[model samples]
Target: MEDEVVRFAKKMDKMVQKKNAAGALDLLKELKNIPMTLELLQSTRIGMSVNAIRKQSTDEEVTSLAKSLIKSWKKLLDGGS
Candidate 1:
C-alpha cells in the first residue's frame, strides 16, 4: 500500500512538473476516492502544489477541467457528496 501510494505520488509529481492539469485532476479524482490517497492529498504540500499548478496553468481546457475537479475536491473537503 505504501509503495503504491509512493508510485501514485511520483506520477502526480511528474504530471504537475509538466503542468498537466487535466492529468493531475484525473489522478486527484482517483485519490479523492481512496482513503489513503485522500489523506495524502489533504496534506499541506500536496494541497499547496495542486493550487500552485491550478494557478500556473494557462491552457483553457486544463483550467476548465481543473475547476471542475476543484469543485469536487471542495465538496468532499466540505463534507458533501
Candidate 2:
C-alpha cells in the first residue's frame, strides 16, 4: 500500500513538474473515489495538489484554479457528495 502510494506520489510529482494541472486533477479525482478514505485522504492530497498548482500556475490561472480548488475542497471536507 505504501509503495503504491509512493509510486502515485512520484507520478503526481512528475505531472506537476511538467505543469500538467489537468493530469494531476485527473489523478486526484481517481484517488477521491477510492473506497477507503484512509487510502485516499482527499484533504491531504488535495492540498498537495493545490500546492503544486499554486507553484506551477501563472498568476491568472493560479487565481482562477486556486479559488475553484478551495471551493471544491470546502465541499469535500464538509461531506458534500
Candidate 3:
C-alpha cells in the first residue's frame, strides 16, 4: 500500500512535470479515490509534494485538484474530532 501510494504521487508529479492539463485532471480525479490515511501522507511526504505541483498550476484546475484533495484529507482527519 505504501508503495502504491508512493507511485501514485510520483505519477502525479510526472503529470505536473510534463505540463499536461487534461492528463493532470484525469489523473487527479483518479487520485481522489485513494482513501488516503494520514500515515500515508506523512510517510510519503506526499502532501508537501502536492503543494509543489499546486504552485505550478495555480492555473485553476490543477490547483483545484490539489485543493480538493487536501480538503478531503482534512475531512478525514476531522471525522470524529
Candidate 4:
C-alpha cells in the first residue's frame, strides 16, 4: 500500500480539524498535482473524509479545491466503471 495517500489523509484530517485554510489549500494544491487512480481512492477510502471538508471549510478556495479533487476522482470512478 502507498503511504502517499496515508500522508495526505493525516495531513488533511489535521488541516480540517484546525480549519486551517491556507494550510489546507496548500495541501490540496499538492494533492491536486498527484495523479491518483480509482484504486488508490477506493482502497484507502479517504474520499468521504475528504468530502467532509465541503461542510467544514470556511474558506471558499478550500471548498473549491476539495470539490475539484472529489469531482476528478469520481470521474475516474465513472471511467473505470
Candidate 5:
C-alpha cells in the first residue's frame, strides 16, 4: 500500500514534469479514491517536490498542475477521500 502511494506520487510528478495538466488531474482524481491515511500524506515528500517544481517552472500548465495537486492533497487530508 505504501509503495503504491509512492508510485502514484511519482507518476504525478512525471505528469507535471511533462506539463500534462489534464493527465495529472485525471491521476489525482484516481488517487483520491485510494484509501490513504493522514499519516502517509503528512510524511510524503511529494508535496515538497511539487511545490519546488511550481516555484521553479514558468509554464502555466505545470504551475496549475502543482496547485491542483496541493489542493487534492488538502482534500485528502480533510478526509474527503
Candidate 6:
C-alpha cells in the first residue's frame, strides 16, 4: 500500500515536472479523495516537492493541490477533511 502511494505521488511529481500543471492538478485532486494513510502523506510529500519546482506564479495549483490534500489528511487527523 505504501509503495503504491509513493509510486502514485512520484508519478504526479513527474507530471508537474513536465510542466503539466493541469495534469498534476488533476492527479492532486484525485489524491485528495483517497483515504489519507501515513503512506498517503509520504506520497503527497512528493507532490510538495513538485511544488518546490514550480515558479511562484505557477504555484497556485500547487498550493491548491496541497490544500486539497490537507483536506483529505485532516479527515484522518482532525476528523474533518
Which candidate leads the pack in lDDT?
4
**Which lDDT values do the candidates have, in the order given?**
0.55, 0.54, 0.70, 0.74, 0.63, 0.56
Give lDDT tens digits, candidate 4, residues 1-81: 347776777777776687664456766677788888787887766677578766676789888998888988888778845
> Where does candidate 6 stray beyond 4 Å?
1-4, 43-47, 50-62, 71-81
lDDT of 3 at 76: 60
Q: Cα-based RMSD of the predictions, in order?
A: 4.7, 5.7, 3.2, 2.3, 5.2, 4.7
lDDT of 3 by residue, 1-81 (tens): 677668767876876677654445655666687778877877876676566677666468878997888787776657765
Q: Which tens-of-lDDT digit does each residue in 17-57 have in candidate 6?
A: 67655555655565555665754565446545444433321
lDDT of 4: 0.74
**Which residue pairs collide, candidate 6?**
none
Instruction: Please list the residue runs of candidate 3 whose C-alpha ends up more than 4 Å from where it truly belongs after superposition.
Output: 14-22, 75-81
- List, residue by residue over 15-37, the lDDT tens digit for candidate 2: 66887555555444444444424
Comparing candidate 1 with candidate 2, which one achieves the higher TM-score? 1
Over 4 Å off, model 4 = 18-22
- Candidate 5 residue-wise lDDT, 1-81, digit = tens: 666667767876775577543445444445447665677777666666566656644666666766876776776667854
Backbone clash total, candidate 5: 0
- TM-score for each of the candidates: 0.47, 0.42, 0.67, 0.78, 0.50, 0.50
Query: Which stretches of candidate 2 lie above 4 Å from their native place?
Result: 35-50, 54-81
